[PDB]
Design an enzyme around this catalytic site. Structure first.
Site, PDB file in Angstrom:
ATOM      1  N   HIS C 240      77.212  81.614  12.397  1.00 14.30           N
ATOM      2  CA  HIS C 240      76.480  80.321  12.531  1.00 14.30           C
ATOM      3  C   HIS C 240      75.810  80.242  13.923  1.00 14.30           C
ATOM      4  O   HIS C 240      74.588  80.092  14.000  1.00 14.30           O
ATOM      5  CB  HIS C 240      77.271  79.060  12.149  1.00 14.30           C
ATOM      6  CG  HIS C 240      76.253  77.988  12.215  1.00 14.30           C
ATOM      7  ND1 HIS C 240      75.431  77.715  11.132  1.00 14.30           N
ATOM      8  CD2 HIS C 240      75.687  77.410  13.288  1.00 14.30           C
ATOM      9  CE1 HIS C 240      74.448  76.925  11.526  1.00 14.30           C
ATOM     10  NE2 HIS C 240      74.556  76.759  12.875  1.00 14.30           N
ATOM     11  N   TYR C 244      71.392  79.822  15.387  1.00 16.73           N
ATOM     12  CA  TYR C 244      70.897  78.974  16.504  1.00 16.73           C
ATOM     13  C   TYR C 244      70.333  79.887  17.612  1.00 16.73           C
ATOM     14  O   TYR C 244      69.326  79.534  18.197  1.00 16.73           O
ATOM     15  CB  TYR C 244      71.977  77.963  16.888  1.00 16.73           C
ATOM     16  CG  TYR C 244      72.211  77.020  15.722  1.00 16.73           C
ATOM     17  CD1 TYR C 244      71.272  76.064  15.363  1.00 16.73           C
ATOM     18  CD2 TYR C 244      73.275  77.219  14.857  1.00 16.73           C
ATOM     19  CE1 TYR C 244      71.423  75.301  14.218  1.00 16.73           C
ATOM     20  CE2 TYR C 244      73.474  76.454  13.720  1.00 16.73           C
ATOM     21  CZ  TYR C 244      72.532  75.478  13.406  1.00 16.73           C
ATOM     22  OH  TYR C 244      72.679  74.701  12.293  1.00 16.73           O
ATOM     23  N   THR C 316      68.394  67.757  16.200  1.00 22.20           N
ATOM     24  CA  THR C 316      67.234  68.541  15.687  1.00 22.20           C
ATOM     25  C   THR C 316      66.051  67.581  15.445  1.00 22.20           C
ATOM     26  O   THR C 316      64.890  67.911  15.808  1.00 22.20           O
ATOM     27  CB  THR C 316      67.590  69.404  14.482  1.00 22.20           C
ATOM     28  OG1 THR C 316      68.777  70.162  14.772  1.00 22.20           O
ATOM     29  CG2 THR C 316      66.428  70.317  14.170  1.00 22.20           C
TER      30      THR C 316
HETATM   31  C1  HEA Z   1      67.020  80.227  12.011  1.00 20.78           C
HETATM   32  C2  HEA Z   1      67.930  80.332  11.149  1.00 20.78           C
HETATM   33  C3  HEA Z   1      68.663  79.172  10.630  1.00 20.78           C
HETATM   34  C4  HEA Z   1      68.718  77.821  11.079  1.00 20.78           C
HETATM   35  C5  HEA Z   1      68.124  77.219  12.293  1.00 20.78           C
HETATM   36  C6  HEA Z   1      69.612  77.187  10.089  1.00 20.78           C
HETATM   37  C7  HEA Z   1      69.882  75.781  10.147  1.00 20.78           C
HETATM   38  C8  HEA Z   1      70.721  75.041   9.255  1.00 20.78           C
HETATM   39  N1  HEA Z   1      71.367  75.591   8.213  1.00 20.78           N
HETATM   40 FE1  HEA Z   1      71.276  77.509   7.570  1.00 20.78          FE
HETATM   41  N2  HEA Z   1      71.302  79.498   7.066  1.00 20.78           N
HETATM   42  C9  HEA Z   1      70.635  80.507   7.572  1.00 20.78           C
HETATM   43  C10 HEA Z   1      69.714  80.372   8.684  1.00 20.78           C
HETATM   44  C11 HEA Z   1      69.488  79.167   9.411  1.00 20.78           C
HETATM   45  N3  HEA Z   1      70.016  77.970   9.085  1.00 20.78           N
HETATM   46  C12 HEA Z   1      70.948  81.839   7.010  1.00 20.78           C
HETATM   47  C13 HEA Z   1      70.426  83.156   7.370  1.00 20.78           C
HETATM   48  C14 HEA Z   1      71.890  81.545   5.956  1.00 20.78           C
HETATM   49  C15 HEA Z   1      72.503  82.510   4.964  1.00 20.78           C
HETATM   50  C16 HEA Z   1      73.541  83.369   5.614  1.00 20.78           C
HETATM   51  C17 HEA Z   1      73.986  84.317   4.530  1.00 20.78           C
HETATM   52  O1  HEA Z   1      74.832  83.942   3.663  1.00 20.78           O
HETATM   53  O2  HEA Z   1      73.398  85.433   4.534  1.00 20.78           O
HETATM   54  C18 HEA Z   1      71.997  80.076   6.088  1.00 20.78           C
HETATM   55  C19 HEA Z   1      72.935  79.382   5.267  1.00 20.78           C
HETATM   56  C20 HEA Z   1      73.342  78.017   5.397  1.00 20.78           C
HETATM   57  C21 HEA Z   1      74.515  77.452   4.675  1.00 20.78           C
HETATM   58  C22 HEA Z   1      75.480  78.129   3.743  1.00 20.78           C
HETATM   59  C23 HEA Z   1      74.963  77.901   2.319  1.00 20.78           C
HETATM   60  C24 HEA Z   1      75.678  78.829   1.339  1.00 20.78           C
HETATM   61  O3  HEA Z   1      75.741  80.063   1.606  1.00 20.78           O
HETATM   62  O4  HEA Z   1      76.101  78.334   0.264  1.00 20.78           O
HETATM   63  C25 HEA Z   1      74.504  76.069   5.083  1.00 20.78           C
HETATM   64  C26 HEA Z   1      75.532  75.100   4.723  1.00 20.78           C
HETATM   65  O5  HEA Z   1      75.604  74.048   5.295  1.00 20.78           O
HETATM   66  C27 HEA Z   1      73.399  75.928   6.052  1.00 20.78           C
HETATM   67  C28 HEA Z   1      72.960  74.664   6.651  1.00 20.78           C
HETATM   68  C29 HEA Z   1      72.044  74.597   7.734  1.00 20.78           C
HETATM   69  C30 HEA Z   1      71.837  73.278   8.400  1.00 20.78           C
HETATM   70  C31 HEA Z   1      72.473  71.946   8.086  1.00 20.78           C
HETATM   71  C32 HEA Z   1      70.945  73.598   9.467  1.00 20.78           C
HETATM   72  C33 HEA Z   1      70.442  72.664  10.502  1.00 20.78           C
HETATM   73  O6  HEA Z   1      70.505  73.319  11.775  1.00 20.78           O
HETATM   74  C34 HEA Z   1      69.031  72.160  10.124  1.00 20.78           C
HETATM   75  C35 HEA Z   1      68.717  70.835  10.895  1.00 20.78           C
HETATM   76  C36 HEA Z   1      67.259  70.499  10.735  1.00 20.78           C
HETATM   77  C37 HEA Z   1      66.777  69.441  10.068  1.00 20.78           C
HETATM   78  C38 HEA Z   1      67.657  68.493   9.353  1.00 20.78           C
HETATM   79  C39 HEA Z   1      65.299  69.178  10.004  1.00 20.78           C
HETATM   80  C40 HEA Z   1      64.743  68.389  11.199  1.00 20.78           C
HETATM   81  C41 HEA Z   1      65.298  67.001  11.270  1.00 20.78           C
HETATM   82  C42 HEA Z   1      64.605  65.842  11.082  1.00 20.78           C
HETATM   83  C43 HEA Z   1      63.113  65.737  10.766  1.00 20.78           C
HETATM   84  C44 HEA Z   1      65.422  64.564  11.284  1.00 20.78           C
HETATM   85  C45 HEA Z   1      65.772  63.785  10.081  1.00 20.78           C
HETATM   86  C46 HEA Z   1      66.661  64.497   9.107  1.00 20.78           C
HETATM   87  C47 HEA Z   1      67.674  63.967   8.407  1.00 20.78           C
HETATM   88  C48 HEA Z   1      68.056  62.515   8.486  1.00 20.78           C
HETATM   89  C49 HEA Z   1      68.423  64.849   7.435  1.00 20.78           C
HETATM   90  N4  HEA Z   1      72.546  77.068   6.127  1.00 20.78           N
HETATM   91  O1  LIG Z   2      73.858  79.530   9.345  1.00 22.91           O
HETATM   92  O2  LIG Z   2      73.009  78.180   8.807  1.00 22.91           O
HETATM   93 CU   LIG Z   3      75.772  78.375   9.277  1.00 25.56          CU
END
Ligand code: HEA
Ligand SMILES: [O-][O-]
Ligand SMILES: [Cu+2]
Ligand SMILES: CCCCCCCCCCCCCCCCCC(=O)OC[C@H](COP(=O)([O-])OCC(O)COP(=O)([O-])OC[C@@H](COC(=O)CCCCCCCCCCCCCCCCC)OC(=O)CCCCCCCCCCCCCCCCC)OC(=O)CCCCCCCCCCCCCCCCC
Ligand SMILES: CCCCCCCCCCCCCCCCCC(=O)OC[C@H](COP(=O)([O-])OCC(O)COP(=O)([O-])OC[C@@H](COC(=O)CCCCCCCCCCCCCCCCC)OC(=O)CCCCCCCCCCCCCCCCC)OC(=O)CCCCCCCCCCCCCCCCC
Ligand code: HEA
Ligand SMILES: CCCCC/C=C/C/C=C/C/C=C/C/C=C\CCCC(=O)O[C@H](COC(=O)CCCCCCCCCCCCCCCCC)COP(=O)(O)OCCN
Ligand SMILES: CCCCC/C=C\C/C=C/C/C=C\C/C=C\CCCC(=O)O[C@H](COC(=O)CCCCCCCCCCCCCCCCC)COP(=O)(O)OCCN
Ligand SMILES: CCCCCC/C=C/CCCCCCCCCC(=O)O[C@H](COC(=O)CCCCCCCCCCCCCCC)COP(=O)(O)OC[C@@H](O)CO
Ligand SMILES: CCCCCC/C=C\CCCCCCCCCC(=O)O[C@H](COC(=O)CCCCCCCCCCCCCCC)COP(=O)(O)OC[C@@H](O)CO
Ligand SMILES: CCCCCCCCCCO[C@@H]1O[C@H](CO)[C@@H](O[C@H]2O[C@H](CO)[C@@H](O)[C@H](O)[C@H]2O)[C@H](O)[C@H]1O
Ligand SMILES: CCCCCCCCCCO[C@@H]1O[C@H](CO)[C@@H](O[C@H]2O[C@H](CO)[C@@H](O)[C@H](O)[C@H]2O)[C@H](O)[C@H]1O
Ligand SMILES: C[C@H](CCC(=O)O)[C@H]1CC[C@H]2[C@@H]3[C@H](O)C[C@@H]4C[C@H](O)CC[C@]4(C)[C@H]3C[C@H](O)[C@]12C
Ligand code: CUA
Ligand SMILES: [Mg+2]
Ligand code: NA
Lengths: 258, 44, 513, 227, 56, 75, 72, 75, 72
Positions: C240, C244, C316
């Site tokens: 995770h 970031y 964010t």
């Molecule tokens: C740059 C890469 C990157 C980034 C920044 C993130 C950011 C986030 N990711 Fe993600 N994620 C991945 C790359 C990334 N992810 C990858 C590679 C996997 C798969 C890994 C694998 O299994 O291979 C993954 C998988 C992954 C999972 C596992 C899902 C599963 O395998 O079943 C989850 C679960 O919560 C998650 C959630 C999030 C959330 C909540 C954010 C947050 O940081 C996002 C926050 C951003 C916003 C919300 C938008 C901007 C906000 C606004 C405009 C404000 C208003 C919004 C609200 C009121 C909601 N992501």
């Molecule tokens: O790792 O979203």
């Molecule tokens: Cu994650």
């Protein structure tokens, strides 16, 4: 320049270090799979050559050429603290593995810790002696530090010699422990956690002892001033790190885990 | 060391056609490698 | 002289250049792997072979794009080039250690390409979960070579983190506080703290996997009292923070690009942006088990990880609204870099929001290990991280090279890439909701239309990658030498000219209190 | 099962899948709204010759930007966690069935009374009966009673697998040395399909799950016939 | 022992244009050539081993 | 008896220890009843619960190890 | 000061080491080895070790470390 | 039977838990046997051991508390 | 500096308090009191308390604190 920072001469050691990493890893592969130690021994050789020449150059740049201004020394202080932090997080992973396995013992173990058929070492015997040894070496290295700051060559050398002697004593006690242990690295998750966590700790004790021996020889050759001795400070910080990791191993694996 | 545009790089830009050859070999080698690895695994 | 300069470097700019070259090459490898994935999925049936060859391709695709393309470009490339210039520093704290961070990566890449060439490759997923990655289900050297690849990449980034943190803390002008450093510099410091804390845990975990494969340990083997799920905890405790790490330098470059092309002296709400990045870095350490909602953890644990994960939306959103408020009242220059940054703001938001969907453990039961996850992470990686890299590349290319790009070509490139990535990934939401699993070489017939369209999108993206190489060639071929840039009063990296001399700030800046 | 050109979830076959559909509709409305607002605000920032390039005060607006999102997150988390706790609620199952993952097929054990067990393999494409589904049919379906609470226990005898049935809202990882529990309740008779949902090597794409849901009386006749 | 740091300061500050890794004299050159020969030779050997291991 | 009821000792998705505990409980009870020469029908509840929850291969492996003298649980 | 830390080194730390050395050198006699039981969670062999005959641990002690098949 | 043998679970001067454990074991066994309608004679060893070790006033107090519904051990 | 510790106060510390205040607020509401059982290790009375009628604890809550004889 009219800044206090160090512009380093172009150096081959980053490349020889990177290539030593390739040779050690490809060498471990060739040892585990293709029944051969050749690449691994080349990589270990080029790694030791690289570390020797790189840290020699840092001594040349500082003691002999005067490049370690206070600003450069401040940077090295941050560098060594950050390195030690990364090493704490490495150990954290092995402690996490240990607590995971020991707090939730699976049916294969007898659903108990220690597992059925595992006879732990008595923590009150050699493991307690090892604890007294590394705590005592923390006292003697502090005596060495104060002797150096007070300008006392003889007492710095005596205190540092005693610190190294204790590091060597720990290492020989642990080697003896390993040979006498009735369990092995192959004795399930008990052996796995015990030998990999204490084994990486023993490697750090050997690294730390080697660093102290470098400081001993530099002190014999008058490199350190009463005010300027960062290699000694870094070695002392590393040595305290090694002690503290031991205390956590002792409490977690030897005592609580017995 | 030489300084300035086209002098702070480990490749020459003195001749644009030699450059095109070098860039072609550079990016092309990288793009080709996975196709040749797949060929290698299939031929086992 | 050539070997002294390019193999024995102690120069932040030349090392940044090596990292950009390395990452550009890696990007071609990762693109080729992405096209093989989409060729296999482009029509129903089998093209290459069974799931082993397919998942060797998928696994290598991920490792190359993350460890060899994004991190080297953003941290090694833009970080080494820009950080010292933005704080008036004469180089990095550890200019020789900096060179070893670079030279560890070609050997790391060689170990990964050796993994794929020996036996049947590492068809494990980039997560390398046991027991599939263990010595029975993946006998032979492939997985060990993958592990060693990750060790070398890990050491490169840990030493690079030590270098960036030390440089950024210790080598500012004495009058300059941390609250007078540019946001890109903050983004690199925070990324470096995440690397320093996360990579050692990954190193511990893959070392345990190595010892289970070769020394008869049983960390992850139930026969010895081990637990495959322990590996998952250790991996995701790194994994995770790693995402970031992938986006934070991108956030920093976006802040600079949006400020620059809005004609502003400064981003909106500077201290809010610093707060948001530090908040995201901290929260990113306490959320890892949202990768494990289907492994059988306790309901209260799933409730905690749902809640903690959703909290990341607040800081964010402050950044997203702050980028919009930077545009607000701007004299907007519709440069190619601005187009990449505007694409970023929108497409990163979409992917962030699908992340918030996935944060819900209950709904994640149905979305986990489906193309919905693939859609989420390609919006944030192939459209966020990549758009930030492309915007940074076209903005700073003239600084690095001394030459201008053709702006019309760069706009054409943006337009092609925008269509390609959206056509590729938007339909994967439908595939995910309707239940198409991850890591499949073939799919039930119902999933044909959206897989066909997704694969057509991947070809459009290939056309953009090919055009980008031409565009870089045209700039070096034509040699339009930069004279001036606007806004140097708030963009110190430009003030030594294009390109800056080998040595800059030999005489440091004057800053009074 | 999925049908051609499908955009959303498979029709809900269990009350919990129905709850997830309603929860997804709620969450997707918010995703659409936030996505749309950000696109709209981008277009608004970019469509005026009016300028303001001097320092802007951020304090007032950052209250709005933190409080409104925090409220929206609470409005997602409340129903999310209600459903989470519903899917953990004590129920009294009338039947326990075990499934064991293998490379590359599932086995099923019905050991409440008799020791019944069998293997469940994908029908190869070359062996499909006319009108049967490529990659989805098996030789031996999971026969289960409809309108009854069933305990499914999931493990593996080799690598990781994951036992999934999208139309029932089910996905439980199959981990060697671990017995994972889920609850299954079908509102309807019929055939309900799923696919292995953890990468497990050569034939990960090719080890599906087929439930056959029948009235209790038919389930009992089928159990008795297996003696 | 006697304090000979001043004499090493004079050697390592001599204006002879050598980089610090070679400034001690001919022994530095020998150790450098040994190291680089082993690194480059070993790397060529590792590539050979890859070629061998890439086929049955 | 239809199936093993909810057991507040094992309320979570991980049921490993539920299977293990009932297997131990059955075999401890059967040893106690054979030891005084008592009656194994007393042990029936534990038998039905473990037979219901435990994978056949787990029961078969544990059975083999008890016969081998390598079963690591206390009976 | 250096004087205080030397006082602690010789007056507390090394005496502690001497007492723990005496404690250890009094409990140093060989323990009676336990009956061999071929437990499936111990003496793990998933791959041969890369030294000796593949079946001996790195610091194998014949007196106290049985093989999978028992004491040598 | 002469008296309670040495029990390696309770090797120290404090024998409180030995009396307690054997009292629990007897009453748990008696409940298990009365329930299925089996034979309390299988519980005899626990009865002899707790009667040997336990002070009369402890047993008397514990028996009173089981009848009251205030016994704090799990039976 | 003061600037940094104010940043931590408002940026991390008070947000944490606000989040835990929300957490507590949501999990508040009277849980149902358990069956009274006159366990001899509870409701100890070796000497009357020096206030009230001697039989009520200092922060006695009639809803959840039974007397030795049960709930009031
Ligand atoms: C740059 C890469 C990157 C980034 C920044 C993130 C950011 C986030 N990711 Fe993600 N994620 C991945 C790359 C990334 N992810 C990858 C590679 C996997 C798969 C890994 C694998 O299994 O291979 C993954 C998988 C992954 C999972 C596992 C899902 C599963 O395998 O079943 C989850 C679960 O919560 C998650 C959630 C999030 C959330 C909540 C954010 C947050 O940081 C996002 C926050 C951003 C916003 C919300 C938008 C901007 C906000 C606004 C405009 C404000 C208003 C919004 C609200 C009121 C909601 N992501
Ligand atoms: O790792 O979203
Ligand atoms: Cu994650
Ligand atoms: C799996 C492994 C992973 C590999 C990853 C590869 C990616 C890493 C990239 C890192 C860069 C490497 C640089 C190190 C030095 C290279 C030396 C060399 O051989 O020179 C050839 C070449 C330059 O040739 P030139 O034009 O004749 O210039 C020579 C000098 O100018 C005039 O000086 P000279 O006359 O002394 O030098 C000339 C001569 C002699 O020079 C020397 O003395 C050098 C001797 C030792 C050099 C060893 C370097 C090896 C590096 C390792 C690989 C990394 O060199 C030669 O031309 C003959 C040697 C040929 C060796 C081939 C090396 C090519 C690079 C690797 C490509 C990958 C192939 C892998 C195959 C995969 C198959 C499965 O240098 C390069 O490697 C540069 C890259 C090629 C050009 C690409 C341009 C693209 C532009 C895109 C821009 C995007 C970023 C923007 C940047 C910002 C602007 C500021
Ligand atoms: C540019 C590059 C090329 C783009 C790629 C090419 C893809 C082509 C588009 C697919 C069109 C599908 C189609 O045949 O539409 C028939 C379809 C027939 O409607 P229906 O079958 O009555 O569906 C009603 C269901 O009750 C509705 O219930 P459901 O259960 O069927 O619906 C759930 C599903 C269905 O949602 C949709 O309908 C798709 C969303 C619309 C696109 C925006 O939506 C998703 O979850 C997609 C999630 C995506 C994440 C959020 C994306 C934010 C986008 C930014 C907004 C900016 C606004 C400007 O027409 C549509 O509604 C269009 C879709
Ligand atoms: C940065 C990370 C990243 C990027 C950019 C991408 C880009 C792409 N990916 Fe992705 N992918 C992953 C990371 C990434 N991917 C990960 C982590 C997985 C999961 C692996 C697993 O399951 O184990 C994955 C899995 C994955 C799958 C799922 C496989 C499966 O489950 O079976 C698919 C399917 O289509 C896919 C396709 C693509 C495509 C078509 C692109 C295209 O969009 C790519 C197009 C090309 C580019 C975007 C340009 C690249 C080059 C540069 C930026 C260099 C520029 C040069 C200079 C600046 C000089 N990838
Ligand atoms: C005396 C004090 C301590 C000494 C330290 C160890 C000495 C030899 C090796 C040194 C390296 C140690 C590091 C830890 C690695 C693993 C095992 C080491 C622990 C050890 O020495 O354990 C021994 C087994 O060693 C074995 O398998 C053999 C081990 C040899 C091969 C190990 C190869 C694995 C290397 C992994 C490298 C990973 C590096 C990570 C870098 C991270 C960067 C991001 C135990 O002996 P045994 O007979 O099973 O039981 C005793 C019975 N009487
Ligand atoms: C929010 C917390 C603030 C505490 C304030 C409360 C009361 C007065 C002062 C407290 C001082 C602290 C400790 C003294 C001992 C006991 C009080 C413990 C805390 C308390 O307040 O305990 C209460 C009992 O108070 C009782 O008996 C009250 C008994 C009151 C008389 C106190 C006797 C004083 C003891 C002598 C002090 C000796 C000091 C030693 C000095 C050392 C010098 C070397 C708990 O209420 P309850 O109804 O039983 O349960 C709750 C049911 N709903
Ligand atoms: C033979 C045994 C087998 C084991 C092999 C593995 C490696 C063992 C290596 C032991 C480490 C030795 C380090 C020696 C460093 C010498 C150079 C030095 O100490 O350099 C000093 C600077 O410190 C600096 O660079 C600080 C440099 C700090 C280096 C930190 C070293 C820790 C290294 C860990 C190695 C990796 C371990 C990871 C294991 C998973 C020089 O400055 P001063 O001292 O102020 O002097 C100047 C004054 O004289 C002026 O008056
Ligand atoms: C399975 C096997 C895989 C193993 C892979 C091994 C990888 C590489 C081979 C290692 C080769 C190392 C050779 C010596 C490197 C010494 C670096 C050093 O000491 O770097 C110093 C800075 O880092 C500092 O201080 C403090 C930091 C010192 C770091 C010492 C290097 C340790 C390398 C191993 C890292 C282990 C990571 C453990 C955490 C998981 C000095 O910086 P320079 O820029 O040189 O000079 C600056 C001048 O001003 C000095 O006068
Ligand atoms: C999210 C989309 C856009 C959000 C825009 C937020 C705008 C904030 C504007 C605050 O700046 C102020 O504007 C006032 C004049 O108008 C000035 O008088 C005042 O001195 C200035 O500080
Ligand atoms: C300056 C850079 C250094 C240059 C590199 C030096 C090259 C070394 C050449 C010798 O190569 C070796 O040959 C051995 C035998 O000829 C092999 O033995 C191994 O292979 C044998 C095959 O017969 C087996 O008996 C055993 O596994 C084992 O002895 C071993 O693998 C291999 O390394
Ligand atoms: C030779 C030197 C005199 C001081 C100086 O060189 O000015 C003295 C001072 C401290 C001495 C060392 C310290 O007393 C500690 C060690 C004592 C051991 O008995 C011999 C080795 C030992 C390591 C000594 C060797 C040598 O006699 C040293 C190094
Ligand atoms: Cu079984 Cu995937
Ligand atoms: Mg999964
Ligand atoms: Na296919």
């Amino acid at each position: 320049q009219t800044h206090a920072y160090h512009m380093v001469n172009p150096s081959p050691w980053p490349l020889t270090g990177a290539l030593s990493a390739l040779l050690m890893t490809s060498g471990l592969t060739m040892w585990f799979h293709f029944n051969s130690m050749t690449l691994l021994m080349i990589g270990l050789t080029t790694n030791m050559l690289t570390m020797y020449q790189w840290w020699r150059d840092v001594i040349r740049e500082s003691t002999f050429q005067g490049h370690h201004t206070p600003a450069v020394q401040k940077g090295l202080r941050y560098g060594m603290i950050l390195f030690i932090i990364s090493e704490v997080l490495f150990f954290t992973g092995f402690f996490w593995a240990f607590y995971h396995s020991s707090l939730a013992p699976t049916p294969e173990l007898g659903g108990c810790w220690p597992p059925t058929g595992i006879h732990p070492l008595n923590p009150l015997e050699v493991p307690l002696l090892n604890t007294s040894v590394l705590l005592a070496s923390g006292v003697s290295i502090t005596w060495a530090h104060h002797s150096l700051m007070e300008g006392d060559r003889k007492h710095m050398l005596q205190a540092l010699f005693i610190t190294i002697t204790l590091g060597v004593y720990f290492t020989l006690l642990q080697a003896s422990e390993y040979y006498e242990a009735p369990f092995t690295i192959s004795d399930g998750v008990y052996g796995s956690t015990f030998f990999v966590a204490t084994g990486f700790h023993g490697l750090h004790v050997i690294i730390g002892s080697t660093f102290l021996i470098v400081c001993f020889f530099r002190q014999l050759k008058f490199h350190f001033t009463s005010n300027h001795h960062f290699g000694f400070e870094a070695a002392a910080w590393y040595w305290h790190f090694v002690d503290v990791v031991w205390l956590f191993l002792y409490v977690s694996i030897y005592w609580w885990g017995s | 060391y030489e300084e300035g545009p086209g002098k702070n790089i480990p490749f020459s830009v003195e001749n644009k056609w030699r450059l095109l050859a070098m860039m072609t070999l550079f990016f092309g080698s990288g793009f080709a490698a996975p196709f040749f690895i797949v060929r290698h695994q299939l031929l086992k | 002289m050539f070997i002294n300069r390019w193999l024995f470097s102690t120069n932040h700019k030349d090392i940044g250049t090596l990292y950009l070259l390395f990452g550009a090459w890696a990007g071609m490898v990762g693109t080729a792997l992405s096209l093989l994935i989409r060729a296999e999925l482009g029509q129903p049936g089998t093209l290459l072979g069974d799931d082993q060859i397919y998942n060797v391709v998928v696994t290598a695709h991920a490792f190359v794009m993350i460890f060899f393309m994004v991190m080297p470009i953003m941290i090694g490339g833009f970080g080494n080039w820009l950080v010292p210039l933005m704080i008036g520093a004469p180089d990095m704290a550890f200019p020789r250690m900096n060179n070893m961070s670079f030279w560890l990566l070609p050997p790391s890449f060689l170990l990964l390409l050796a993994s794929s060439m020996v036996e049947a490759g590492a068809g494990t997923g980039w997560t390398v979960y046991p027991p599939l990655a263990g010595n029975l289900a993946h006998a032979g050297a492939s997985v060990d070579l993958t592990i060693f690849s990750l060790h070398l990449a890990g050491v490169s980034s840990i030493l690079g983190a030590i270098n960036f943190i030390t440089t950024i803390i210790n080598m500012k002008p004495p009058a300059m506080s941390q609250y007078q450093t540019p946001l890109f510099v903050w983004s690199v410091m925070i990324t470096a703290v995440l690397l320093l804390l996360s990579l050692p845990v990954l190193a511990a975990g893959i070392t345990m996997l190595l010892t289970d494969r070769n020394l008869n340990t049983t960390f992850f083997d139930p026969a010895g009292g081990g637990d495959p799920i322990l590996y998952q905890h250790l991996f995701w405790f790194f994994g995770h923070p790693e995402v970031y790490i992938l986006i934070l330098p991108g956030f920093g470059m976006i802040s600079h690009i949006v400020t620059y092309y809005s004609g502003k002296k400064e981003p909106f709400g500077y201290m809010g942006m610093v707060w948001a990045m530090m908040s995201i870095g901290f929260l990113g350490f306490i959320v890892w088990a949202h990768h494990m909602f289907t492994v059988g953890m306790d309901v209260d644990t799933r409730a905690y990880f749902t809640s903690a994960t959703m909290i990341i939306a607040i800081p964010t959103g402050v950044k997203v609204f702050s980028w919009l408020a930077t545009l607000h009242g701007g004299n907007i220059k519709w440069s190619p870099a601005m187009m990449w940054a505007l694409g970023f703001i929108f497409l990163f938001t979409v992917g962030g929001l699908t992340g918030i969907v996935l944060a819900n453990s209950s709904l994640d039961i149905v979305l986990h290990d489906t193309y919905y996850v693939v859609a989420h992470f390609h919006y944030v990686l192939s459209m966020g991280a990549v758009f930030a890299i492309m915007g940074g590349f076209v903005h700073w290319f003239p600084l690095f090279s001394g030459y201008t790009l053709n702006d019309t070509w760069a706009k054409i490139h943006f337009a092609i890439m925008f269509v390609g990535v959206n056509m590729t990934f938007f339909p994967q939401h439908f595939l995910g909701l309707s239940g198409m699993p991850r890591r499949y070489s073939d799919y039930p017939d119902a999933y044909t239309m959206w897989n066909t369209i997704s694969s057509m999108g991947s070809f459009i993206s290939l056309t953009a990658v090919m055009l980008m190489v031409f565009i870089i060639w045209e700039a070096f071929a034509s040699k339009r030498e930069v004279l001036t840039v606007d806004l140097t009063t708030t963009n110190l990296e430009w003030l030594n000219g294009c390109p800056p001399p080998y040595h800059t700030f030999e005489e440091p800046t004057y800053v009074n209190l | 099962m999925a049908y051609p050109m499908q955009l959303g979830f498979q029709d809900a076959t269990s009350p919990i899948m129905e709850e997830l559909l309603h929860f997804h509709d709620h969450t997707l409305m918010i995703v659409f709204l936030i996505s749309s607002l950000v696109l709209y605000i981008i277009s608004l920032m970019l469509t005026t010759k009016l300028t303001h390039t001097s320092t802007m005060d951020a304090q007032e607006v950052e209250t709005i930007w933190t409080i409104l999102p925090a409220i929206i997150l609470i409005l997602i988390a409340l129903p999310s966690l209600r459903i989470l706790y519903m899917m953990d609620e004590i129920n009294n199952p009338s039947l326990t069935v075990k499934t064991m993952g293998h490379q590359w097929y599932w086995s099923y054990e019905y050991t409440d009374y008799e020791d019944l067990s069998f293997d469940s393999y994908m029908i190869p494409t070359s062996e499909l009966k006319p009108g049967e589904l490529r990659l989805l049919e098996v030789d031996n379906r999971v026969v289960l009673p409809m309108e009854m609470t069933i305990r499914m226990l999931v493990s593996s005898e080799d690598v990781l697998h994951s036992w999934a049935v999208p139309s029932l809202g089910l996905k439980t990882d199959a981990i060697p040395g671990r017995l994972n529990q889920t609850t299954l309740m079908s509102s309807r008779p019929g055939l309900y399909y799923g696919q292995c949902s953890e990468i497990c090597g050569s034939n990960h794409s090719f080890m599906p799950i087929v439930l056959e849901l029948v009235p209790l009386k038919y389930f009992e006749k089928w159990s008795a016939s297996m003696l | 022992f006697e304090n000979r740091v001043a004499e090493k300061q004079k050697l390592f500050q001599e204006d002879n244009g050598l980089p610090v890794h070679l400034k001690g004299g001919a022994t530095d050159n020998i150790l450098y050539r040994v190291t680089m020969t082993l690194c480059l030779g070993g790397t060529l050997y590792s590539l050979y081993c890859l070629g061998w291991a890439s086929f049955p | 008896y239809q199936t093993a009821p909810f057991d507040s000792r094992f309320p979570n998705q991980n049921q490993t220890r539920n299977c293990w505990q009932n297997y131990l409980d059955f075999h401890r009870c059967e040893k106690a009843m054979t030891a005084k020469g008592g009656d194994v029908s007393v042990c029936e509840w534990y038998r039905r619960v473990y037979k219901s929850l435990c994978p056949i291969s787990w029961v078969s492996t544990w059975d083999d190890r008890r016969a081998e003298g390598t079963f690591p649980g206390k009976i | 000061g250096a004087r205080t830390w030397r006082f602690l080194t010789f007056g507390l730390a090394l005496p502690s080491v001497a007492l723990c050395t005496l404690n250890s050198w009094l409990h140093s006699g060989h323990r009676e080895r336990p009956a061999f039981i071929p437990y499936h969670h111990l003496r793990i062999r998933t791959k041969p070790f890369s030294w000796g005959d593949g079946n001996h641990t790195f610091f194998h002690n014949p007196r106290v470390n049985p093989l999978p098949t028992g004491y040598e």
